[PDB]
Amino acid sequence: IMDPRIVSEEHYEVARRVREILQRYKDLQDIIAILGMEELSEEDKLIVQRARKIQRFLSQPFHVAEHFTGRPGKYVPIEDTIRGFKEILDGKLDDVPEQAFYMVGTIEEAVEKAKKMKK
Amino acid sequence: IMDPRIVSEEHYEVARRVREILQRYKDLQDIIAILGMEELSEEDKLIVQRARKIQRFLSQPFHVAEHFTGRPGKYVPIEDTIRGFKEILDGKLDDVPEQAFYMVGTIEEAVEKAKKMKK
Amino acid sequence: IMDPRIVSEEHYEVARRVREILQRYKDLQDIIAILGMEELSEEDKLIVQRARKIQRFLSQPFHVAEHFTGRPGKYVPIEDTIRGFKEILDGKLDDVPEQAFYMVGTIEEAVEKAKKM
Amino acid sequence: MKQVAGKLRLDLAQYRELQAFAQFASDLDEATRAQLERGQRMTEILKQPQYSPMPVEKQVVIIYAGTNGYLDDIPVEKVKEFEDGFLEYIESKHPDILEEIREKKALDDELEEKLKKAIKEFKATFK
Amino acid sequence: SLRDIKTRINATKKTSQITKAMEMVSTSKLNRAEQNAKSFVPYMEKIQEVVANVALGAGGASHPMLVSRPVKKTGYLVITSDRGLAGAYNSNVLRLVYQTIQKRHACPDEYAIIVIGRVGLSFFRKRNMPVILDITRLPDQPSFADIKEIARKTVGLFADGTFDELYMYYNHYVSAIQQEVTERKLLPLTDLAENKQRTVYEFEPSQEECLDVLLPQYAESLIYGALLDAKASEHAARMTAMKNATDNANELIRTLTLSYNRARQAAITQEITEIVAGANAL
């Protein structure tokens, strides 16, 4: 189903942009372990910072996982999945800490959680 | 026999403290093979400085080896090995060069071997 | 067969000197890629020039190639190629264009090709 | 294609080696900058979508335009928009270039017409 | 494990190509640093000789910058690089200045420290030592006007009588493989050059005001000269460090490649023998 004729235009764009930023980060994180993060350029630093947040926002608390997560469980509809990933790709939430995306649901919760974290 | 119940408390602390420094230096070993030790700073640098001395003080001239090298063989009592490694770990012999712990018996021999070199 | 007990002393020396100059030029190639030719030392430049001319003098116009190019073809005896490279290594022909050594046979042909230009 | 693809082979071969190391560096020699910039643009011309094969006459025209370096003022993201825009101007000339490239296959004689149309049409509209 | 060692090869291959990128870019920057330094040498020669000749010729020592004085307190200038991959370049200048301050002074109030570069600043921020100036983020190509205000503070504090003795620590560029940790005494000018050939100078401007103008020009020139050599030696040090790092990675790639080929052949002979043993049994 990941064909431009079947899905919406922004669904196709957001899905292809997620794979490119994470594929770029995958090859670059290996280098950082030997050269150190101080030696890489500003475009690389920006890709690392956004890729970390994207990779964590892919996480979600399941209803069947309450015993393993200590959380109640949440459902996210397709429009909210597309809307949430787009703000991260466009850099809107560069200020939010990378620890505000673990086991969360909708993107509004990440901003509320950052306020609870006093930031 | 390496259990708190069988060995002396002094022996158990010295033996466990030796394996921690040797394991930490085996973790740094894969990165220094490329970059060398010029990048390392503070405790990681000090840990390799002591680990070098410890690795050499485990070498001993045997009586059966007199037929290969002109050096006489040596027998080292348990009280002398524990005291020598304890002083190396504490840092009392940090000023002595690393080449003064090769094929020796007791810690006092390292002091005179360093004095012979004059460095 | 490359040992001096089978090949003559000049055959061994000419082969060793050719490998030493070509190996030294391969080192300068990444330096030449990052920096300009004018910056190299006088001795470094005197080896880069020699190496390019020696590498071109290794080239030869074959007889089977007459269907694809105007070049007729050339057979060079062992005694003539050893004699030729020895003159090049001493710098006797450094005051000659690099194209004089390109796709040629014996050393006298490079001299006549230079005189024609 | 033999006349045009020769330049593509050299420009693309010098790019495969250069990007693996010189991609991150801010200031290098102008030659290396031009080699990277040309290699990035030629690797955008080779990208293509499914079920849209290109006739050889259209392929040699776009490759010729890129190899000669007329895309040096075009951003790396705009190269795909330039392919469709240039091929739209060529729709008016399909009657001329289809018969000449399909029958004569002589891109050596055709150089004057390709250079004239590509430079005057885009420079007049883009300025 | 055959699958595990392959990841190490892929890592070493990419990281070697990146240490090679840092070698080529540092090589280009070393040439500009040496070219730029050689361009200011004629200027440095002209400005330093004219101020030296008027400061020592046809007159006695009567100015606080030239005259010997009892030392109440002293200052030190040490210059270092902003990033850490330069090799032993930063550690050796810090070693010499640290051992020297400890050898003749036992309290932090006795001396003042002037430092250039993030690693030098970090070295004085860690442990416990005072700092009067902490400049960082200077451009790759420094101009005479870039460090003008930093030099003005250092010579100004001396001219105002706050410091009685001043030293400079920096690396000197000799060759692409050799760089020397070097030390100089900037003030007081207890020693000066003598050309043995002299010409007349104007007697209208006051002796004190004339010296007060030419002394800072010499200090600014000397500090700028030290930076030119320090940036050239930094790029030379990083070029050698990256060359060795790339060579160590290329050697590790062939040794790992050979081990992978042994594992590949071992896995195939073991697999084929388990297959044939099973077929023979059946």
Swiss-Prot record, chain E:
Quaternary structure note: F-type ATPases have 2 components, CF(1) - the catalytic core - and CF(0) - the membrane proton channel. CF(1) has five subunits: alpha(3), beta(3), gamma(1), delta(1), epsilon(1). CF(0) has three main subunits: a, b and c.
Cellular localization per UniProt: Cell membrane
NCBIfam families the UniProt entry points to: ATPsyn_F1gamma (TIGR01146)
Protein name per UniProt: ATP synthase gamma chain
Function in brief: Produces ATP from ADP in the presence of a proton gradient across the membrane. The gamma chain is believed to be important in regulating ATPase activity and the flow of protons through the CF(0) complex.
Protein's GO biological process: proton motive force-driven plasma membrane ATP synthesis
Gene3D superfamilies assigned: 3.40.1380.10, ATP synthase, gamma subunit, helix hairpin domain
Sequence similarity: Belongs to the ATPase gamma chain family.
Leader sequence segment: none
GO MF entries: ATP binding; proton-transporting ATP synthase activity, rotational mechanism
Disulfide bonds: none
HAMAP family: ATP_synth_gamma_bact
Cellular component terms (Gene Ontology): plasma membrane; proton-transporting ATP synthase complex
Topology class, membrane: Peripheral membrane protein
Short name of any one Pfam family annotated for the protein: ATP-synt
